[PDB]
């Protein structure tokens, strides 16, 4: 894996070519990524090419804020999957919300290792 | 004597090389699950042929593969053989359509061993279901459990379903969540259930257009079906009125309902009060989901009073996003120190802050406390509560799973937790920390933990 | 994502041919159970080889095979890779002697993932168990469940065992049933327990030589270990005295014991009375085995009175061979007609006669009755009670399993039961008819029923 | 000719070479024979020659009686396994009891199809 912490990031938040941006896509990608046991309440996926994301961890497309938290310059195609159900246990049901917005990530060694999920709660 | 083999592959495409080795297993496993494996109508022939010579097949699960009407027709042909003993079949999300229900109808008629069928997430529509009910109505069909979520059904499908129910006394579960059957359909379905002699055990009508009126209907099913153990009605605009309408049946002495799901049903503290009359009178109710209802601290208040009274033996309570604030924590703290039945409490997505959490921690840290799972995700927790949580983890001996996801906890707060959890005297087995930022070092220490103490899973 | 495979072979001579076909599976299964398959020390080398390249292995059960200290040494080596994450290992009845406990002591310190070990039915001796505990005391040993039934241990082993207990805070289960550790051993053990910080969940000392005296020690453990869920003391001469000494610990408000096995402990109606006080006070006690105690209809009356009192939420009651006669059946009939918590009743080996049985059926046919499993084997029932039984099988809807073995039910009686069980309105799933004679005509009749209603299993 | 009913009989009541005759043996042979789920309360195994067992059914090894109930003219080596435990559910513990007795069987078409277990309840 490419710098584990960064690879962990890509596994949880990156889908180059979504091929679906609906409830069905969410239910499916969450499972394939292993964020379903237990059900992860909220997860946002960034689409497009990786280089664009990397860049955020610099000043070509990124821009500082707080705890190594950079709010990207450019906007990204994203899909946020939100848990919609009665219990915290699987099977996990997700409602998908597609958007085109800038992301906020934490950078370490010039690589994104954390996605701030808060901004994706309410639009 | 015995030779039981099981194959269960999930989210990973095989490849003709891997697929080649797997084929002969398909001939000997009693349980076969190929979930989301990129199976194509092409490999369905291998499956069919291998399943034909499989004398032990009891369960077949092919969920999330693009089989289509023809692909399914193909696999089902490997099952129409005088030696097949299949008991459970899932074709969930397999690109099946109304036209694929013909094959399904025949199979059903010629397989009396099959008791459970999962057809959720396939656009069958009313036309498809109608065809399906023809095999279901066959006297040779012994199906007792049917799941039809996200099947594109309308109120039109309720008449045929009601007729199957009225005719099969050994029917146990009907799940029709996420289909817009609405008030008309729900009422018909109910008529079928009341007239039916079936000892239904589980009925799920989540996001089905259920209304308050339907509640008088449901009240009847609940009051009379003594076999009923699970009723899921989440995501239906039932309201406090529907609540009041439903309660009388739950209190019926014959009812032994164990699980009730009424999340996001638009219930406020008022219907909560009605609900509480039930909780304090029925020791049979073990699980209750009230997530997504604006109950407020007034609602938490009522709940907590009930949880501290005799008669209430609720084991799991899910109250995620119920509009609770730090103010209700003093009451929850009392339940956690006193109550000896509640083992699972989900209070995530409630603004309890470090204040409320410190108090919850008080009650939990008491002797005799029995809580096993606590979800405090997104609860406005900071590095501030991590000292009280760290201590509680050592004071308390019942917790086995803790969820602190999405909390502005920091490197500082995490350290404190890593400190107690390392202890051999801490018996926690799972700690969920999703979406929480921590440095490479904290990260390091976390992987230390995972290696030193293998009995504990640290999630993300 | 996932690729889970398991292999469970029980009582089957394999053959070098089939043996070769199974080897590759041992390399990829997460669970491997080769129970009584005639494995030699030769096939052990094959096992060790596949095991060490298997990263998946979580459970290995080699129960009942002539392995020996040699073959077990071989198999154990395969678990020597730093990729090993084995969690459950059973080497029950494997011909392991005390000389082989050395390797075991050695491996135990290098397998921090291993949590459960079954060594029952091996002549280990106090010598062997001594060596073993040396490894167990190793801080790298994370064992939580140990089973040592029939291991030729004497009171000598209890001190070492007490030392491990006193040392490991997460020990959860200890089973030393069927070892003559006697009063002394049981005393030492209770000492190590009374002060260990472990949250023991299960303690089994059946046929251990426990005396009514040890009942005071046990009373202390019960009173203080809130984590204790299961206590097995069957086949020990405790008597009505021991019982009186144990009850006070059971009445403790901190004790939440769920299962209590006190079969053949020399109790009578007298001790049964003390026990009944506990029952009406603790709704936590769900399972109780009183089989083999000469309670008589007098003890049955006490039980039934408590079972009707609110507070007793017993779910399973095994009272086989308790000297009950038809006289108690009017009472048990009341409980079955009223009690909403009891789902399992074993009154086998009691002379209930056709009269007692026709009385039980009345309560069972009441609307709302909940019993699921009823054992009436060897109860002096005949064709006379069969019309009553057949009617109740259609009147009651909760019953799922019925045992009428060793009763002189004739072709006439069996016929009546077959008529009922044939109906779809009969949800019974298991019918045990051991050692009952019927003609070939009835044999066919039953075979026909078997093919027609596959959901129902008729045992022999 | 060995067939079904007779075969079922041999399966549940015939063990040619005892290879031991104590608890251990019982516990083991019972699982082996599938009389363990659930625990059969009592079960007697007849040892020796198969054909001397067959004889009982047609005045050869057993005098003709009622319902075709017949007692054997000679004594057989037998081992009776009795359920010793506190529950009807496995694992099943058995106390073995060996003896040399006449056996009483039900005969059909000259074949033993049922063994009378009640005479074995008391040593």
Swiss-Prot record, chains A, D:
Subcellular localization, as worded in the UniProt entry: Secreted; Nucleus; Nucleus, Nucleolus; Cytoplasm, Stress granule
Record carries keyword Disulfide bond: yes
Annotated consequence of substituting residue 40 to I: In ALS9; reduced ribonucleolytic activity; low angiogenic activity; reduced mitogenic activity; moderate reduction of thermal stability
GO BP annotations listed: actin filament polymerization; angiogenesis; antibacterial humoral response; antimicrobial humoral immune response mediated by antimicrobial peptide; cell communication; cell migration; defense response to Gram-positive bacterium; hematopoietic stem cell proliferation
Any Gene Ontology CC annotation: basement membrane
Active site, UniProt feature: 13 (proton acceptor), 114 (proton donor)
Residues recorded as bearing Pyrrolidone carboxylic acid in the entry: 1
Known regulation of activity: Has weak tRNA ribonuclease activity by itself due to partial autoinhibition by its C-terminus (residues 140-147), which folds into a short alpha-helix that partially occludes the substrate-binding site. In absence of stress, the ribonuclease activity is inhibited by RNH1 in the cytoplasm. In response to stress, dissociates from RNH1 in the cytoplasm and associates with cytoplasmic ribosomes with vacant A-sites: ribosomes directly activate the tRNA ribonuclease activity of ANG by refolding the C-terminal alpha-helix.
EC number: 3.1.27.-
Result, substituting residue 40 to E: In ALS9; uncertain significance
Disease note: Amyotrophic lateral sclerosis 9: A neurodegenerative disorder affecting upper motor neurons in the brain and lower motor neurons in the brain stem and spinal cord, resulting in fatal paralysis. Sensory abnormalities are absent. The pathologic hallmarks of the disease include pallor of the corticospinal tract due to loss of motor neurons, presence of ubiquitin-positive inclusions within surviving motor neurons, and deposition of pathologic aggregates. The etiology of amyotrophic lateral sclerosis is likely to be multifactorial, involving both genetic and environmental factors.
Similarity comment: family membership: Belongs to the pancreatic ribonuclease family.
Designated name of the protein: Angiogenin
Organism, scientific name: Homo sapiens (Human)
Taxonomy of the source species: Eukaryota, Metazoa, Chordata, Craniata, Vertebrata
From-to range in the entire protein, with total length: 25 to 147 of 147
Swiss-Prot record, chains B, C:
Cellular component terms per the entry's GO annotation: angiogenin-PRI complex; cytoplasm; cytosol; extracellular exosome; lamellipodium; nucleoplasm; nucleus; plasma membrane
LRR repeats: 19-47, 48-75, 76-104, 105-132, 133-161, 162-189, 190-218, 219-246, 247-275, 276-303, 304-332, 333-360, 361-389, 390-417, 418-446
Subcellular location: Cytoplasm; Nucleus
Positions bearing Phosphothreonine: 81
Region listing for 2 X 5 AA tandem repeats of S-L-D-I-Q, in residue ranges: 1-10
Domain of life, per lineage: Eukaryota
Gene3D superfamilies linked to this entry: Ribonuclease Inhibitor (3.80.10.10)
GO biological process, one term: mRNA catabolic process
Principal subcellular localization: cytoplasm
UniProt keyword list: Acetylation, Cytoplasm, Disease variant, Leucine-rich repeat, Nucleus, Phosphoprotein, Repeat
Modified positions (Phosphoserine) in chain numbering: 90
Keyword check for Repeat: yes
Pfam family, one: LRR_6
Effect of residue 457 to A: 25-fold reduction in binding affinity for RNASE2
GO molecular function: ribonuclease inhibitor activity
N-acetylserine modification, residue list: 1
CDD domains the record matches: LRR_RI
Subunit structure: Forms high-affinity heterodimers with RNASE1, ANG and RNASE2.
Function, as annotated: Ribonuclease inhibitor which inhibits RNASE1, RNASE2 and angiogenin (ANG). May play a role in redox homeostasis. Required to inhibit the cytotoxic tRNA ribonuclease activity of ANG in the cytoplasm in absence of stress. Relocates to the nucleus in response to stress, relieving inhibition of ANG in the cytoplasm, and inhibiting the angiogenic activity of ANG in the nucleus.
Record's comment describing the protein's domains: The LRR domain forms a horseshoe-shaped structure that interacts tightly with target RNases via a large protein interaction surface on its interior side.
Disease (UniProt): Encephalitis, acute, infection-induced, 12: An autosomal recessive disorder apparent in infancy or early childhood, and characterized by acute encephalopathy triggered by viral infections and febrile illness. Neurologic features of the acute episodes include seizures, hemiplegia, decreased consciousness, hypotonia, abnormal posturing, feeding problems, and respiratory insufficiency. Disease severity is variable, ranging from death to normal neurologic outcomes.
PANTHER family with a match to the protein in the record: NACHT, LRR AND PYD DOMAINS-CONTAINING PROTEIN 12, NACHT, LRR AND PYD DOMAINS-CONTAINING PROTEIN 3
Protein name: Ribonuclease inhibitor
Organism field: Homo sapiens (Human)
Lineage: Eukaryota, Metazoa, Chordata, Craniata, Vertebrata
Gene: RNH1
